[PDB]
Design an enzyme around this catalytic site. Structure first.
Site, PDB file in Angstrom:
ATOM      1  N   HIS A  77       9.056  40.059  -0.037  1.00 32.43           N
ATOM      2  CA  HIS A  77       9.400  41.483  -0.016  1.00 32.43           C
ATOM      3  C   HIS A  77       9.484  42.191  -1.359  1.00 32.43           C
ATOM      4  CE1 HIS A  77      13.542  41.565  -1.004  1.00 32.43           C
ATOM      5  NE2 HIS A  77      13.917  40.807   0.006  1.00 32.43           N
ATOM      6  N   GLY A 135      19.182  44.162  -5.730  1.00 33.35           N
ATOM      7  CA  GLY A 135      18.680  43.509  -6.912  1.00 33.35           C
ATOM      8  C   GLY A 135      18.953  42.021  -6.947  1.00 33.35           C
ATOM      9  N   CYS A 147      18.239  39.778  -4.581  1.00 33.89           N
ATOM     10  CA  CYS A 147      17.297  38.961  -3.842  1.00 33.89           C
ATOM     11  C   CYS A 147      16.580  38.037  -4.799  1.00 33.89           C
ATOM     12  CB  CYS A 147      16.299  39.835  -3.101  1.00 33.89           C
ATOM     13  SG  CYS A 147      17.070  40.756  -1.765  1.00 33.89           S
TER      14      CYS A 147
END
Ligand code: S7W
Ligand code: S7W
EC number: 3.4.19.12
Lengths: 306, 306
Positions: free
Chosen positions: B41, B143, B145
């Protein structure tokens, strides 16, 4: 987005941990530049700890009696001195992994991370607070002395704690990195009892702000209070008195949430008087006091260290 | 001697964290040897996350669209591929700080440390468990991830988790390092609800053993029970059923304390039926389930990592 008891990344401190052996005793040291810091009770046998005369015991020690090992490599000790309750072992090699660092003596109520170590090797990391009675509630076994506590601001490690003693009640006592004990404790196996373990009120309030930010809001009520009224309640429950300085420190969390500090104090007052009625706040069934206002802002804002 | 929620030392993992930017999106990657792993993603905009076709979105990306930065140095991307829900970015330089490591897919009930990171920079470390509903209760902001979870056995880091998603209820979902989600979650902004958050019974029992080792013994009683009787109670309180495998895993803690597993189950039964009556166990007012039997032995025995 979640709120956890979070320690600082430990890598900068891992690179400073060494093993120090004197005679029969092995514990941990902290290697910064060309000095290794460790507790002065490395020179004691178990029998010496009941009534040690450290200056006399140290007369019998020379540089070559302090065996200092960084992982598998041995360090050469070229001098030694005692500062308060720590020994400073000068070695012939500066630690190439020395981070930017400072020595800080923290105030009761402040938090820090502990890197628990054994035989110079890191075992785990957890977050502690300096309690108002100058103990810490740590996890330390035999061999963990010389493990350190620290904070990190961006790239600079502020060392604030070195572990020395477990009291008979299972709590922990130690020094700053100048070797001065926190509180009245001494490095002697004697009757040392901790005082009242008071709750750090400003930290509880900070954690309630953290809870609201994360959607645990059930404890918000329709009430307010005053500093003096609140403190009558704090006193009954062995909470630290709240001061205007504390209110001011909570200002940013108040501004972000729109909840006036004294309104949050009224929420805490009700929680103290009525308990939590089997409910939880941020996954806890008691009022948590080992997050500072700074810890809450930091964790809620994602500050990182370089 | 104290018992704390303790994370593994984070230094070995800090040395692997990098920043990955694709277009407008920045998150964290894990640099091991010459591969950087990150969530797939990273290629999505906020709008793409409602209904992303990852293979189609990836067609528009080339190696030079993945900006990978390790501290202040830029890494050269020489290939990219998607494996399940992760991207593998091949870089031209092996990470010189790569620790010994393995990729493990953990079972619900197992614990691990998370190194929370932002923009490739470590922020903090804390201990988590894979919940029985395959969520984790973490602390992750936008932020974060690509932050990872891991365990360490002596010198080897076993990576088990990479963070991908926050569900609407504030809990967290992610993948193993092969990019397969834990549980049924998907990397799409959709209605995903977690199932029942059941309590990890074997872990609660382990923590009760830890409590006894440390002198919190008030919950020991005069009773025993059987697996089947205990499990009738576990079921009512949304506890995982206890099996003989669990009893066997608790064998060492049983042997060390001299408390038969089924006697400890009878203590837990009384605690579930009667609550704690305003008392605490190891500083907690609820029954803690994020320490495994191995975690308890380790922390009570001082195992270190080289
Ligand atoms: O007492 C001290 N002496 C020092 O040399 N430093 C320098 C050495 C590396 C970063 O800081 C820091 C101190 F706190
Ligand atoms: O998949 C893998 N590939 C590897 O090369 N390693 C080696 C590289 C360094 C220590 O382990 C481990 C793996 F798990």
């Amino acid at each position: 987005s979640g709120f956890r008891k979070m320690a600082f990344p430990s890598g900068k401190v891992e690179g400073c941990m060494v093993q120090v052996t004197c005679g029969t005793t092995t514990l941990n040291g902290l290697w910064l530049d060309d000095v290794v810091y460790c507790p002065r009770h490395v020179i004691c046998t178990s029998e010496d700890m009941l009534n040690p005369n450290y200056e006399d015991l140290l007369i019998r020690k020379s540089n070559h009696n302090f065996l200092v090992q960084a992982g598998n490599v041995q360090l050469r000790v070229i001098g030694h001195s005692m500062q308060n309750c720590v020994l400073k072992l000068k070695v012939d090699t500066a630690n190439p992994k020395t981070p930017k660092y400072k020595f800080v003596r923290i105030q009761p109520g402040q938090t820090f991370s502990v890197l628990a170590c054994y035989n110079g090797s890191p075992s785990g990391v957890y977050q502690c607070a300096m309690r108002p009675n100058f103990t810490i509630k740590g996890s330390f076994l035999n061999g963990s002395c010389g493990s350190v506590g620290f904070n990190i601001d961006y790239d600079c490690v502020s060392f604030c704690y070195m572990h020395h003693m477990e009291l008979p009640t299972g709590v922990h006592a130690g020094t700053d990195l100048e070797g001065n004990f926190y509180g009245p404790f001494v490095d002697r196996q004697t009757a040392q009892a901790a005082g009242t373990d008071t709750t750090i009120t400003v930290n509880v309030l900070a954690w309630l702000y953290a809870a609201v930010i994360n959607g645990d809001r059930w404890f918000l009520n329709r009430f307010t209070t005053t500093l003096n009224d609140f403190n009558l309640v704090a006193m009954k429950y062995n909470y630290e008195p709240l001061t205007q300085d504390h209110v001011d420190i909570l200002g940013p969390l108040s501004a972000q949430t729109g909840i006036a500090v004294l309104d949050m104090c009224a929420s805490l007052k009700e929680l103290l008087q009525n308990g939590m009625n089997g409910r939880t706040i941020l996954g806890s069934a008691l009022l948590e006091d080992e997050f500072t206002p700074f810890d809450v802002v930091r964790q809620c804002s994602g500050v990182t260290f370089q």
